[PDB]
Amino acid sequence: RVAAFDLDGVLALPSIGPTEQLMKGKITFSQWVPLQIFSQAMAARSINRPMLQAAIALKKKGFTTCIVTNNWLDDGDKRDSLAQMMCELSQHFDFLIESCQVGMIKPEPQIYNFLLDTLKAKPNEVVFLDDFGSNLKPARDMGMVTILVHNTASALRELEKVTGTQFPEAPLPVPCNPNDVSHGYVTVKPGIRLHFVEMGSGPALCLCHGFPESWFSWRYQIPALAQAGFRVLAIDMKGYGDSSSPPEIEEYAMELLCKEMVTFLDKLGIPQAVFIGHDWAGVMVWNMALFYPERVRAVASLNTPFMPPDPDVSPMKVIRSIPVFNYQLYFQEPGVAEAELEKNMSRTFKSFFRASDETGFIAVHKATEIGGILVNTPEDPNLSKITTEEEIEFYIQQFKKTGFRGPLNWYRNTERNWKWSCKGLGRKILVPALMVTAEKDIVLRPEMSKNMEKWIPFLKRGHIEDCGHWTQIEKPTEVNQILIKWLQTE
Amino acid sequence: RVAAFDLDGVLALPSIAGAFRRSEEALALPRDFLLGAYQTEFPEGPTEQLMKGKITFSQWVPLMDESYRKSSKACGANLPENFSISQIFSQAMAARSINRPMLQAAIALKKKGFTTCIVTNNWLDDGDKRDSLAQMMCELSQHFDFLIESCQVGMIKPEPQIYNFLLDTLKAKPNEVVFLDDFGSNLKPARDMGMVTILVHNTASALRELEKVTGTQFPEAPLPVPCNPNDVSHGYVTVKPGIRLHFVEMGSGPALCLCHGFPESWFSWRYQIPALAQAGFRVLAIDMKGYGDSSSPPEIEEYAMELLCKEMVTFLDKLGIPQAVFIGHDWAGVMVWNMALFYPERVRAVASLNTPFMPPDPDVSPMKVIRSIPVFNYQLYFQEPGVAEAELEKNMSRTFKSFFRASDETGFIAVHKATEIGGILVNTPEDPNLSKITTEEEIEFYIQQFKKTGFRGPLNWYRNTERNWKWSCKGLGRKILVPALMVTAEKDIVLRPEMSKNMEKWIPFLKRGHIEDCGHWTQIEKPTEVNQILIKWLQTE
Numbered sequence A: 001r002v003a004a005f006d007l008d009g010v011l012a013l014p015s016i017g018p019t020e021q022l023m024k025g026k027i028t029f030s031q032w033v034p035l036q037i038f039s040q041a042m043a044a045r046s047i048n049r050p051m052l053q054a055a056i057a058l059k060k061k062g063f064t065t066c067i068v069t070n071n072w073l074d075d076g077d078k079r080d081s082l083a084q085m086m087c088e089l090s091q092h093f094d095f096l097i098e099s100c101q102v103g104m105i106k107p108e109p110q111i112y113n114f115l116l117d118t119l120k121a122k123p124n125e126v127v128f129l130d131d132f133g134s135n136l137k138p139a140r141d142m143g144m145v146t147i148l149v150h151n152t153a154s155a156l157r158e159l160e161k162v163t164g165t166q167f168p169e170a171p172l173p174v175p176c177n178p179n180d181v182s183h184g185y186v187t188v189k190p191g192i193r194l195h196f197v198e199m200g201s202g203p204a205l206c207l208c209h210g211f212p213e214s215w216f217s218w219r220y221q222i223p224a225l226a227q228a229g230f231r232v233l234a235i236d237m238k239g240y241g242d243s244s245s246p247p248e249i250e251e252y253a254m255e256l257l258c259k260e261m262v263t264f265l266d267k268l269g270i271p272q273a274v275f276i277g278h279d280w281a282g283v284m285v286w287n288m289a290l291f292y293p294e295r296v297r298a299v300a301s302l303n304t305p306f307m308p309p310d311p312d313v314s315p316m317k318v319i320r321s322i323p324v325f326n327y328q329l330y331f332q333e334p335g336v337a338e339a340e341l342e343k344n345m346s347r348t349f350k351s352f353f354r355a356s357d358e359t360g361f362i363a364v365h366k367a368t369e370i371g372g373i374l375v376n377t378p379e380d381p382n383l384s385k386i387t388t389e390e391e392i393e394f395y396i397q398q399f400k401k402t403g404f405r406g407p408l409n410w411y412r413n414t415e416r417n418w419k420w421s422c423k424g425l426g427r428k429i430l431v432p433a434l435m436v437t438a439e440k441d442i443v444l445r446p447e448m449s450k451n452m453e454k455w456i457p458f459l460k461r462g463h464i465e466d467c468g469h470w471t472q473i474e475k476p477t478e479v480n481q482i483l484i485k486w487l488q489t490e
Numbered sequence B: 001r002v003a004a005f006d007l008d009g010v011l012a013l014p015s016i017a018g019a020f021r022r023s024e025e026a027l028a029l030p031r032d033f034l035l036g037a038y039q040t041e042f043p044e045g046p047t048e049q050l051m052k053g054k055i056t057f058s059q060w061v062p063l064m065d066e067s068y069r070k071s072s073k074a075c076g077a078n079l080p081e082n083f084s085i086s087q088i089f090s091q092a093m094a095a096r097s098i099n100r101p102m103l104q105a106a107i108a109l110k111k112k113g114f115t116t117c118i119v120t121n122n123w124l125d126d127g128d129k130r131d132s133l134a135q136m137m138c139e140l141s142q143h144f145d146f147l148i149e150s151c152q153v154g155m156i157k158p159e160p161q162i163y164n165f166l167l168d169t170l171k172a173k174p175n176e177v178v179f180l181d182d183f184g185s186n187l188k189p190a191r192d193m194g195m196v197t198i199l200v201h202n203t204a205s206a207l208r209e210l211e212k213v214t215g216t217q218f219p220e221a222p223l224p225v226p227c228n229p230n231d232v233s234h235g236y237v238t239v240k241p242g243i244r245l246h247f248v249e250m251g252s253g254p255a256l257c258l259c260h261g262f263p264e265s266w267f268s269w270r271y272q273i274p275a276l277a278q279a280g281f282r283v284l285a286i287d288m289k290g291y292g293d294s295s296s297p298p299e300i301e302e303y304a305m306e307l308l309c310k311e312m313v314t315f316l317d318k319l320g321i322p323q324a325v326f327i328g329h330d331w332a333g334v335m336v337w338n339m340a341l342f343y344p345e346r347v348r349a350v351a352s353l354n355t356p357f358m359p360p361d362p363d364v365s366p367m368k369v370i371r372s373i374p375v376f377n378y379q380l381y382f383q384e385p386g387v388a389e390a391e392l393e394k395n396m397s398r399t400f401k402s403f404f405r406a407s408d409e410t411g412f413i414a415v416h417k418a419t420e421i422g423g424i425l426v427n428t429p430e431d432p433n434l435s436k437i438t439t440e441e442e443i444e445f446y447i448q449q450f451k452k453t454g455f456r457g458p459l460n461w462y463r464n465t466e467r468n469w470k471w472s473c474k475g476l477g478r479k480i481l482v483p484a485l486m487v488t489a490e491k492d493i494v495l496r497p498e499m500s501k502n503m504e505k506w507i508p509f510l511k512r513g514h515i516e517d518c519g520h521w522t523q524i525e526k527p528t529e530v531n532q533i534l535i536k537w538l539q540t541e
């Protein structure tokens, strides 16, 4: 079947002659100063989330969702209030049936037959619900499953849970994806192009992903950040997904990555953004902050701490010591781990992406002994409760284009990176910063960030309990909160 | 060849120096006491660690304040206790803008074929108005091929280090390169290697004289920065199943969609795009459904206005924007106004170029009204499918130079005679002179961009004559309230100004814009103007 609700006050609230038909669309708001004080009433009404969530559910579930409300056209000033609130609901329903458009209001039987026509279905297999009920007269007539909404849910979730089946109580933020998205495509150097995704309106914040991921990762913070009130630019890190991913090694020097990261802003014409890296990106994100502070309004790292280099300590040597940094050494040899990971990506990803309470992880340190970062990993990885089968399939497809050379090439510029950063040795980071640490991150544990403020005074902190290395995907609702609260505050 | 420029004193101004001088004013402080940090010949210390890029600038406050306290009363001269240099630099910088004329001359020899660059003693700024710094660096970004900043490589002017590194970077000789600096004590080293010195003393021109000579001569009031076309972001939203919308993006928020007309491409706004970005907005110059890189089906209903506008919305939705400034020209302006009429929420403001708001009379078949305006013939000609396609397509090379001509250009189109002769380019020579308003490449693009779509789809915009009327016949009771602008072109043959005299009956407060000596090709013809107005508009309301 299909499920429908009205907005008047069921999917948004607090709820609410020339007035009776401006609904039909023959007149605007401003041009209607007869029979004013509410150009705010509408303002002070936002989304009814448990209700809005009920939708994505059913849509994920197999229905077609809609809005068939009695509208009007706001040339108001608290107009945008509407735009956004609408631009928000937008993607989650397939049909927008508004009175101010199809000329026919609620409750004239029109809209109902019109609705049913619009999708083409029987009065029975389509449910409806209005805060009004005086509107559910017709729908009950024809023969459709009616539902009131006199509270802010109740039987809504409950009696509507009848539908097919139910929904939860503490939801994940909404996903977002993966072609209902703008696909920008800046080209920096000759052969080098950078793909990315865009959502929401300014100011800008670049979401730089890590190894071995894709922009797809922020799939939960992207919408949220947009709504937050920012223009998100979730990029595919050089070498990954739809951006150019050469074979050359020097190609992935940090010095390089950061420089290009700038040419990106230039080309796109932005003079400053909020860089927010995680994993190997956070490294860059901080270097970003260290080498081009102008173009950075603020920085946030996820799990990754600011790890300066000791001028009197070969960088390699230091990698050979941290027991857990083995895999990392394993990698250093070209074609090798490529060959290992590539062989069967299906396994590769479910092995990598597992939680903080998940068996079968990676072989961080035995990796050289065992001679393979997956050898203690099953042969038929169990789907991590932290991803879906499609969630994986995307990562695969996205990786079939690049292979693994390039993403791995990020490790392989060990010496030089050190060589280069050995200049931000005299400097200190001043532009707003945030270090969000994950309690149970096996490599890149919190402990490694305790000195940071020696470098980054004012460094603000974020800490998420029960975390894996897969922060966004694992504790998103949290990540969002913090991330937003951060941007809001500073 | 090549010529690179310092960014202070020549490209960015008024210089940071002057600031120093007039604080060496605000306080006893004898000639050069404060500037000397910046200006020396033999550089050392706190600023030396800045220029070299060892420590940011904020670091550099504590250190250099207290570095001055040294030479203060301690060593001649009286320097105040509760004293500083911070916001008397983070101010003098935020107060320095681009030397319009320089940049102009800079783009010149890039066009003329030099490598342009800037070799400046920069520094990293983690300051407040640090942003001010980015924009300026953001802008100049394109016009110079090279960026040798002291604070990046690690050498400083005039330490020979840099020059020699610049040379090794281009890979030229001290001769075939020119240089200029507000300093001269900086110039010393290059007039030694063997480069062409230019004491960029003044605000310039004095410069641009014994400089004009070398290289060439610079136009009086050059052509406005025209974003161009390879190195621009290429967004790609997909609204309906088979339908995708290509567009271009430049600059940071708020957003304003530049909707082009027939028979063009997003490429048209190539002069307002940069300008609007700089203006301070995020430009989204779209390829109108059916044109260029966006999906251009064959179906007719496909281009219904009702449709085009609806999708235009799904566009915002997908891209996640709840409101924009729609600015149409030609057939787009029609949509742009309908935009305003049917989705006022999503419109913060509207601007039409040449196109007036032309409501439909409910008691007057729309077709009939087209048959009357003498000039609306071509328009009728079009109505027949495959026909004008076949005509225009045959040789696009001619097609475009014919269409795009000025207000003082012979060989235009056959607006009204059309049908009779059975064509619009029938009398248009079959070998057109290049309109002084375009370049050969300017044309080649339009071509290439059109080879992908053919002409069906762009023309399909005409062909929904009745329905469009049918639909708009609802905004008959409404009035447009969201900010509006009607900019009229004095000599637009069809879509003349006269046709907009009634508009305010519909659009009270409608603000006005009028450009003299104009063709239908407004942006491409009188851009510098268009820009001005357009900006002044967005600035004001």
Ligand SMILES: O=C(Nc1ccc(I)cc1)NC1CCCCC1
Pocket (backbone or CB within 6 Å): A211, A212, A279, A280, A283, A304, A307, A328, A352, A362, A443, A469
């Ligand atoms: O290797 C890194 N991160 C990293 C390595 C070196 C630096 I300098 C910064 C981050 N991530 C791994 C963690 C375990 C699962 C695969 C990805």
Ligand SMILES: O=C(Nc1ccc(I)cc1)NC1CCCCC1
Pocket (backbone or CB within 6 Å): B262, B263, B330, B331, B334, B355, B403, B413, B494, B495, B520
């Ligand atoms: O036809 C239009 N514009 C137009 C037509 C109908 C409407 I309703 C609005 C604009 N433009 C022509 C002008 C002459 C050169 C080719 C393009």
